[PDB]
Design a protein around this ligand. Structure first.
Ligand SMILES: Cc1ccc(-n2nccn2)c(C(=O)N2CCN(c3nc4cc(Cl)ccc4o3)CC[C@H]2C)c1
Ligand SMILES: CCCCCCCC/C=C\CCCCCCCC(=O)O
Ligand SMILES: CCCCCCCC/C=C\CCCCCCCC(=O)O
Ligand SMILES: CCCCCCCC/C=C\CCCCCCCC(=O)O
Ligand SMILES: CCCCCCCC/C=C\CCCCCCCC(=O)O
Ligand SMILES: [N+]
Ligand SMILES: [N+]
Length: 499
């Protein structure tokens, strides 16, 4: 009789630790969202769902798995031989489908051009769908689980035990079921989340975000008046209200065609004589020739096709009155953040990130396709410029800092969510390969070392339950709001504060 295992001490200890940690942590997640209305976000409603799935399996499956792995015997009868494996797979499905909808919700918010944000009622409905789908697609698992009894002995049996395992009537079905199980609970959702989070990362960290250490007013000297006077002097222009465009020259993207048409519109107006235009860029030679014809015709229009250093551009932002951003399409809007940080108040098409950045007290928005709209906005800016614009310049700087912090907050949430996904991928990797190798490829049949293989399965099961314990710990280290509410919990229980 084989009896005892060398690793039972650590398996029992690790299950006790994970049980306590997973139960308390996931309950506190629920408590944090339920007790604090400011935590009620679609992301956090999904996170609550994850914690409910983890509580479910922590209570109904973890204790059974410990006993089975230690004893290789099923003590809990026929109904629980079906119910517990069913709950386990339903919870895995809930976890991976919840993680998936977390990722899709973030992709629409951050990556989609209209930046969709889901209501809490909509999130709840999604949560209901997740549970219904999961309970339905795991019905086969409940069907296939069976207890078998074994009679060990030579002649007359004197003892017996019952084990709980899958019952297949052919070699094809278990292969197909467990192929699908790997794809539905692990492989497909992971691929979906890696792709979605790669674009999110790419938008949040690399295409969006400004060098807040380079683009600031502190590197500028003297008053804005002194600097504008000297900029126009260096550019051979008279004093006046100064508008700047900087960007590649194209039709349908950066809008220089709209600005140049708008300049033609303005040029027959008496107000045109008070305005100065600085047009910086390169591209379509037909658009370049249009700009150069206008610069030659009009003393108050300057065109720069040469490459400027970043220090030079920063001086421009810190000298001009207004920056004109007549984009058709502008997902990120670095010009607006850069210009606003240096006090230049933006006149921009209401598209994309420009519409996100610019408010009614921090710039002038115009229809992205309309040259007459841009001309009217430039005229309004001239009249604004007849008075002190300092309050407006301060509003721009403050708004740009606030946006930068806002980008930063989205980064912290996204980084935390990617860590959760990574920890899910790791914790479920071992069981997934063992399950595929065993059920699809028929390995471990011949038990030349059944001991090592059984040990690998027991570690892999524990690691699955450890995932339930890890998620609240991740939120504590990577989320300041969860950390504070966790702290509130520990103080209400150990101390009794009730904050
Ligand atoms: C214990 C445990 C935990 C997680 C598992 N997982 N694999 C992939 C994803 N998650 C598995 C596992 O290999 N699964 C999942 C469902 N199954 C299962 N058997 C169980 C036995 C006990 Cl005592 C308790 C729960 C049980 O769930 C039988 C099918 C099989 C494929 C088993
Ligand atoms: C639920 C569990 C929450 C938090 C425990 C995380 C690990 C220990 C944290 C100690 C306190 C801290 O550093 O904030
Ligand atoms: C007011 C109208 C602003 C321009 C139209 C909005 C479209 C946004 C976009 O270009 O994606
Ligand atoms: C194919 C699934 C792989 C899952 C683990 C690795 C990726 C985890 C999270 C990815 C999002 C961030 C991508 C890189 C930046
Ligand atoms: C907060 C008080 C909750 C009710 C009493 C629990 C006592 C547990 C303890 O402090 O050890
Ligand atoms: N430039
Ligand atoms: N416009």
């Amino acid at each position: 009789y084989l009896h005892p295992k060398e690793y039972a001490w650590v398996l029992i200890a690790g299950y006790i630790i994970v049980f306590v940690v997973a139960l308390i942590g996931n309950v506190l997640v629920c408590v944090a969202v339920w007790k604090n209305h400011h935590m009620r976000t679609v992301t956090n409603l999904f996170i609550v769902n994850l914690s409910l799935a983890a509580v479910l399996v922590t209570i109904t499956c973890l204790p059974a798995t410990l006993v089975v792995d230690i004893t290789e015997t099923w003590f809990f009868g026929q109904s629980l031989c079906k119910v517990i494996p069913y709950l386990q797979t339903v919870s895995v499905s809930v976890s991976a489908l919840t993680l998936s909808c977390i990722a899709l919700d973030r992709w629409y918010a951050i990556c989609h051009p209209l930046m969709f944000k889901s209501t809490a009622k909509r999130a709840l409905n999604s949560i209901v769908i997740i549970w219904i789908v999961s309970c339905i697609i795991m019905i086969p698992q409940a069907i296939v689980m069976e207890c078998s009894t074994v009679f060990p002995g030579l002649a007359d049996k004197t003892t017996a035990f019952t084990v709980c395992d899958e019952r297949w009537g052919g070699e094809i079905a278990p292969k197909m079921y467990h192929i699908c199980f790997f794809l539905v609970t692990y492989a497909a959702p992971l691929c979906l989340m890696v792709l979605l989070y790669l674009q999110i990362f790419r938008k949040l960290w690399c295409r969006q975000g400004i060098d807040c250490s380079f683009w600031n007013e502190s590197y500028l000297t003297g008053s804005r008046d002194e600097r504008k006077k000297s900029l126009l002097s260096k550019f051979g222009m008279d004093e006046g209200v100064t508008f700047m465009f900087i960007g590649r020259f194209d039709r349908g993207q950066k809008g220089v065609d709209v600005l140049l048409k708008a300049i033609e519109i303005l040029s027959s107006k008496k107000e045109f004589q008070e305005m100065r235009f600085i047009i910086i860029g390169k591209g379509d030679p037909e658009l370049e020739g249009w700009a150069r014809s206008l610069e030659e015709k009009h003393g108050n229009v300057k065109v720069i096709t040469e490459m400027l250093s970043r220090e030079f551009v920063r001086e421009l932002y810190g000298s001009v009155d207004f920056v004109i951003i007549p984009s058709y399409f502008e997902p990120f809007g670095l010009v607006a953040l850069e210009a606003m940080c240096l006090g230049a108040i933006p006149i921009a098409s209401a598209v994309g990130g420009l519409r996100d950045i610019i408010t009614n007290e921090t710039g002038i928005l115009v229809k992205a396709g309309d040259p007459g709209e841009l001309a009217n906005a430039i005229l309004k800016a001239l009249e604004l410029s007849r008075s002190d614009l300092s309050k407006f310049r301060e509003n721009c700087k403050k708004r740009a800092m606030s946006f930068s912090k806002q980008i930063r907050a989205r980064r912290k949430t996204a980084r935390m969510l990617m860590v959760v996904v990574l920890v899910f991928a790791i914790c479920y990797a071992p069981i997934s390969i063992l399950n595929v190798l065993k059920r699809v490829f028929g390995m471990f049949a011949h038990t030349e070392d059944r001991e090592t293989v059984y040990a690998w399965f027991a570690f892999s099961h524990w690691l699955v339950y450890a995932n339930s314990a890890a998620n609240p710990i991740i939120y504590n280290f990577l989320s300041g709001k969860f950390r504070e509410e966790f702290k509130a919990a520990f103080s209400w229980w150990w101390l009794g504060v009730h904050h």
